[PDB]
Ligand binder design. Structure first.
Ligand SMILES: [Mg+2]
Ligand SMILES: [Mg+2]
Ligand SMILES: [Mg+2]
Ligand SMILES: [Mg+2]
Ligand SMILES: [Mg+2]
Ligand SMILES: [Mg+2]
Ligand SMILES: [Mg+2]
Ligand SMILES: [Mg+2]
Ligand SMILES: [Mg+2]
Ligand SMILES: [Mg+2]
Ligand SMILES: [Mg+2]
Ligand SMILES: [Mg+2]
Ligand SMILES: [Mg+2]
Ligand SMILES: [Mg+2]
Ligand SMILES: [Mg+2]
Ligand SMILES: [Mg+2]
Ligand SMILES: [Mg+2]
Ligand SMILES: [Mg+2]
Ligand SMILES: [Mg+2]
Ligand SMILES: [Mg+2]
Ligand SMILES: [Mg+2]
Ligand SMILES: [Mg+2]
Ligand SMILES: [Zn+2]
Lengths: 50, 91, 69, 114, 99
RNA sequence: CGUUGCCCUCGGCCGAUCGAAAGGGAGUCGGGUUCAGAUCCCCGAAUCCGGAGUGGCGGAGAUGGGCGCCGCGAGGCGUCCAGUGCGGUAACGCGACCGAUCCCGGAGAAGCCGGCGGGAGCCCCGGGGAGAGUUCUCUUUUCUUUGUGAAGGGCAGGGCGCCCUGGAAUGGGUUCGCCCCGAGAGAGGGGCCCGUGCCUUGGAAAGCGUCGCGGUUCCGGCGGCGUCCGGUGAGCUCUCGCUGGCCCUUGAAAAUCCGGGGGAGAGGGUGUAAAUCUCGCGCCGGGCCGUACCCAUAUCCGCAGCAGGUCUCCAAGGUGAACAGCCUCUGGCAUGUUGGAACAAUGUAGGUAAGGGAAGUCGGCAAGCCGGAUCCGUAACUUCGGGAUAAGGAUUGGCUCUAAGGGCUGGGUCGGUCGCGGCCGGCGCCUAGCAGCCGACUUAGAACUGGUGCGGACCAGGGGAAUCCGACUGUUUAAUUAAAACA
RNA sequence: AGGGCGAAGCCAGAGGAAACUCUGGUGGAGGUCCGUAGCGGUCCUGACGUGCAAAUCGGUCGUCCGACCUGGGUAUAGGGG
C-alpha cells in the first residue's frame, strides 16, 4: 500500500523469505522425497493471508 | 406592475404549487424579506436573520420577534396586557 | 540571510567566536563580503573596489577569507 | 505547458492541502504548500463586528513565537477589546457610579427626614 | 546610434568556396528596409568589403539576425548549406565555418 | 541550592480510555546525486519545538534630580530622595518592558450560491538575442529557448464596520448591483491589516541556452558569450478580498495557542537587584514506525494480462458559446491474445437509391426530416407565471471598404528672480475642450464576386390537433416491469 | 463546462390633479429549460447470448444547484435489520 503498519510489514517480510526455491544440495541428502518447494506463491495468482 | 401583473415575489416559483398556495406565500414572502425600522437607532435595517430572530445591521441589536414579521400581533397584544396588569399590581 | 550597511558592523560580526569563512564575491560593480555564522549568513555590499581591497586586509586572526571563483 | 503534481501523499484538494505556484531558480514551476490565513482577534465587547487593529493576524499557535508588542496594543484592555467599547465602558462605569452616589444621597436625606 | 554588424567569412573564402564581392552585391540587393528591397532604403544602411569580412552599418533600428537569414538564403542559393554553418562568433558578429 | 518526608494552605468539573495516513494539528526549501531512493542522500540557505543549571554574552530594567562642599572649568567627593520603559490629540506606535491562584475574551472554529475587483500560473501580441527548419519562387522567416526557493528587510497593490478636523437639503456621496450620512456625508489629513506582487539579502558562485576547448581513458573537467525590453484581456486555473441572495436548512468538536481584568507577591537600596508572555546574538538535543513500484483496456476486485467495476490533483494551440465534437504541440502508444491470401452466401456496423410516400406493420418499430446563429413572426388555452425554439418565414460564404463604440499624457504660456529645472507675481484658464501617443475587440451598413455555394466537416429540437392517467421536480423492482406504482 | 428564460429590488423618462400607470434599462430569482463531466438506464424488444461480461457493448435516451453525486468513518443483524 505504501502506508504500512509495522505488524504488516514484518508479516510480508517473512512471506517474502518463504518463497525461495529449494537448495539443490537437499536433493542429494540420504532419505529425500522432496523434488520442488510446492509452497511457492506468485503475487499475480494467490493473494496472501490478507 | 412593470414586469408582472399579479405574481411579484412569487414569480420565482413559476407555474408550480398552485395559485392559492402561491398567493398565500406572497404575503409572508414579502414581509419576511422586508427591511423594517430598528426602533433603537431608527435606521431601516431590521432584517430577519433566521426564523424568529431579526437583526439590525447598524444597531447590532438582535431581536427575538415573529417568524415572518418583526412583530406578531399576538406578541403586541400580550405586551400591552402585561403592562396593564403590572400597573394594576404595583399602583 | 542578512544584509549589512556599515563596514564596521560586518567587521564586528566577523570578529565573533561563532564565525568562520568570510568569502568575498567580486561581482564587478559590487564586491560582496559573505561571512557565515552559526545562525545567519551575513553579507555586506561594498560598491567601491579600492575600499573592498582595503577591507580585505582588515579581517583579523587568520579566518578562511576563501575568495570566490 | 508544464503541468505539475502534488508534493505530498495527500491527493485530495482539502483545507490542509492548499498550494501555490512558484518558479524556482532551476526554472521549473513547482507547488509550494501554503499556510492557512490567520485572523485578527474580534472584540471582547461582542457587538463591534470589526476585528481588532494593531495585532498580527496569524494562526494562533504562532503567537507563541511573536513578540508581546505584535500581539496587543498599549491601552487598558489592549488587543482584547476595541477602543470605542473601552471609552464607552469607561464613561458608562463612571456615570453609573455617579448616579449610585446620587441615589445614596437621596436615601440618606430620606433617613434624616424620617 | 550606430548599429555595426560584421559577418566575417574568413576560411570559406580562403578555401575559395564562395566570393565575398558577390555576397556583398547580393546583400546590397536584398537587405530590406521598411519593406523596400532595393536601394538600402536610401542612404541608411551601409555595406563594407574587406576581402573576407563584411560589415553592415545602420543608423535606423536594424536586427542582427536578419544578416543570419540572408547569409543562410545566400548559402542555399550557392548550394553551400551542407558544409557551411553560420554562427555568432561574438556579439555584433557572425562567422561562416565548416562542420 | 536542590531533592525528598511530614504538617498546614488551595483546587469544581465531568469522566478511565478508544475513535480521522481527506477534519483540527508548531516547524523545510533551492540545487545536485542513483540501474532502482530522495522536501529523507550531498551542497547551500533556513526553520520550529524542548532544554540552557552554575546563567554563555551583550542590550532593556537604569542609572536622573536635589542639596552641600571642593575645583578657574571639565568635574570629584559628602549626603538626601525618585526610578517595575517611553512616544503620539487619537486610531495607535516603538527591540525588551515584573507578577501567582482567580476571572473574561479571542484564535483553533465554519453552509451553499451569485456578482464584482486585486494578485499570480498559463495563453496572446509587439519587438531584442542564441540555436533551428524552410529557401524552385516568396518569406527582416517560421520553431524552440530566453530563470530565481524558503526566511528576513524595504516598497507597491489591495482592504478597513479605525482616528482627528469639520459640519452636509438646491441634499450629497457612490456601486456592474447596491449601499452610506447629524448615531456625522462629502473634503482634507492620518492609523491598522494583508502584502503569495516587485526590489533586495539569499544569488550567480548555483540553473538553463548557446559557441568552444582539456581528457585514447577515468573524468560530475574547465572557458567564453547570453540569460533582454515592452504591451494586452467578460481570456482560462488558483488564490486573496469586498459585497449581496437562499433557508420552517443557519451549516463540528476538542487538543493546542494567545490577549486582556485583576493585583496576592518579589526586588535592591543610589550601583546595582529581582525581572524580561526577551530584544539581539551563543550552546545542546529531537527517539519510534511508514517511505520500492503499479494505481489500471497487464501489478487492485470481478476464477484470467476479462470491453465490467474502483476516490483525487495538474490540464497547452486552432475552430467554436463551450472542459462539445473535429485537427494539432508537449508527453505517450503500437490497434487491445496472432499473421498471410482471397472478396462467395448468410450475417454485424455503416451508406445510397428512380417513381410513389406508411399502401408496410399490433403499432411509423427502424431511419428520415428538423437542427446553430441573426432578423422578423408567434395561436388555442392558462394557475396570468407560462404555452414558446409554439407554428410560419427570411438571411448566412469569400473579398474590398465604411461607420460606430476606449485609454493615457500634455496649457499655470507673460515678467522677475534662483539653479533644460525650480520659486514668486501677474495674465491665461482649452472650464463647448483641442492636441499628440497607445490598445483590445465586437456590432451594423455598403460594393464586388462565385456553376445559388455558404451554420459547406464537426456540433445541432421534426412539428401540429386531441383524448386517458399522474399536478409538478423526486423515487422504484442490482439481473425481463420506470409506470398510471411509491413520494 | 457553456447557453436560454429573465422573478423581487433599483434607476431614468413619459403620463396622471391624485391613486398610481406606462416605456426603456438594470438586476439575476428558480427542487426553471437546453446541455457537458457526473449520476442514471427509455427504445432499438439492435449487438452479444458455450459472451469481453454469472447482466456486458453500441447508438438512442432521462437528469444535470438539488429530495444532486460521491470517498473514508460510524450506527442498525436474521422472524432481525
Ligand atoms: Mg488479482
Ligand atoms: Mg489533515
Ligand atoms: Mg502593536
Ligand atoms: Mg486518539
Ligand atoms: Mg469622508
Ligand atoms: Mg514513492
Ligand atoms: Mg495514471
Ligand atoms: Mg483494428
Ligand atoms: Mg497486431
Ligand atoms: Mg489487451
Ligand atoms: Mg426511394
Ligand atoms: Mg396490410
Ligand atoms: Mg395500414
Ligand atoms: Mg423512432
Ligand atoms: Mg403547443
Ligand atoms: Mg372527458
Ligand atoms: Mg408523475
Ligand atoms: Mg429490473
Ligand atoms: Mg428497463
Ligand atoms: Mg435484444
Ligand atoms: Mg451465436
Ligand atoms: Mg478481445
Ligand atoms: Zn466595540
Amino acid at each position: 500500500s505504501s502506508h504500512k503498519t509495522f505488524r504488516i510489514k514484518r508479516f510480508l517480510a517473512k512471506k517474502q523469505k518463504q518463497n525461495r526455491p529449494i537448495p539443490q544440495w537437499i536433493r542429494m541428502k540420504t532419505g529425500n522425497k522432496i523434488r520442488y518447494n510446492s509452497k511457492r506463491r506468485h503475487w499475480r495468482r494467490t493473494k496472501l493471508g490478507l | 406592475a412593470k414586469r408582472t401583473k399579479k405574481v411579484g415575489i412569487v414569480g420565482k416559483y413559476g407555474t408550480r404549487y398552485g395559485a392559492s398556495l402561491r398567493k398565500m406565500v406572497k404575503k409572508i414572502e414579502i414581509s419576511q424579506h422586508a427591511k423594517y425600522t430598528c426602533s433603537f437607532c431608527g435606521k431601516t435595517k431590521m432584517k430577519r436573520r433566521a426564523v424568529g430572530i431579526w437583526h439590525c445591521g447598524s444597531c447590532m441589536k438582535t431581536v427575538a420577534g415573529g417568524a415572518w414579521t418583526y412583530n406578531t400581533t399576538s406578541a403586541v397584544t400580550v405586551k400591552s396586557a402585561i403592562r396593564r396588569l403590572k400597573e394594576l399590581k404595583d399602583q | 540571510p542578512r544584509k549589512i550597511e556599515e563596514i564596521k558592523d560586518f567587521l564586528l560580526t566577523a570578529r565573533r567566536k561563532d564565525a568562520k569563512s568570510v568569502k568575498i564575491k567580486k561581482n564587478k560593480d559590487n564586491v560582496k563580503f559573505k561571512v557565515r555564522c552559526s545562525r545567519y549568513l551575513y553579507t555586506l555590499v561594498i560598491t567601491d573596489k579600492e575600499k573592498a581591497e582595503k577591507l580585505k586586509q582588515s579581517l583579523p586572526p587568520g579566518l578562511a577569507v576563501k575568495e570566490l571563483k | 505547458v508544464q503541468r505539475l503534481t502534488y508534493r505530498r501523499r495527500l491527493s485530495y484538494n482539502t483545507a490542509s492541502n492548499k498550494t501555490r505556484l512558484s518558479r524556482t531558480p532551476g526554472n521549473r514551476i513547482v507547488y509550494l504548500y501554503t499556510k492557512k490565513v490567520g485572523k485578527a482577534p474580534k472584540s471582547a465587547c461582542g457587538v463591534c463586528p470589526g476585528r481588532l487593529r494593531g495585532v498580527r493576524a496569524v494562526r494562533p499557535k504562532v503567537l507563541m513565537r511573536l513578540s508581546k508588542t505584535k500581539k496587543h496594543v498599549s491601552r487598558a484592555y489592549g488587543g482584547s477589546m476595541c477602543a470605542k467599547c473601552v471609552r464607552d465602558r469607561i464613561k458608562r462605569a463612571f456615570l453609573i457610579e455617579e448616579q449610585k452616589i446620587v441615589v445614596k444621597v437621596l436615601k440618606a436625606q430620606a433617613q434624616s427626614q424620617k | 546610434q550606430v548599429l555595426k554588424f560584421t559577418l566575417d567569412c574568413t576560411h570559406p573564402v580562403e578555401d575559395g568556396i564562395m566570393d565575398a564581392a558577390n555576397f556583398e552585391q547580393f546583400l546590397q540587393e536584398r537587405i530590406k528596409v521598411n519593406g523596400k528591397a532595393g536601394n538600402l532604403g536610401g542612404g541608411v544602411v551601409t555595406i563594407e568589403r574587406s576581402k573576407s569580412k563584411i560589415t553592415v552599418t545602420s543608423e535606423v533600428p536594424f536586427s542582427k539576425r536578419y544578416l543570419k537569414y540572408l547569409t543562410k538564403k545566400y548559402l542555399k542559393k550557392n548550394n553551400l548549406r551542407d558544409w557551411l554553418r553560420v554562427v555568432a562568433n561574438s556579439k555584433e558578429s557572425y562567422e561562416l565555418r565548416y562542420f
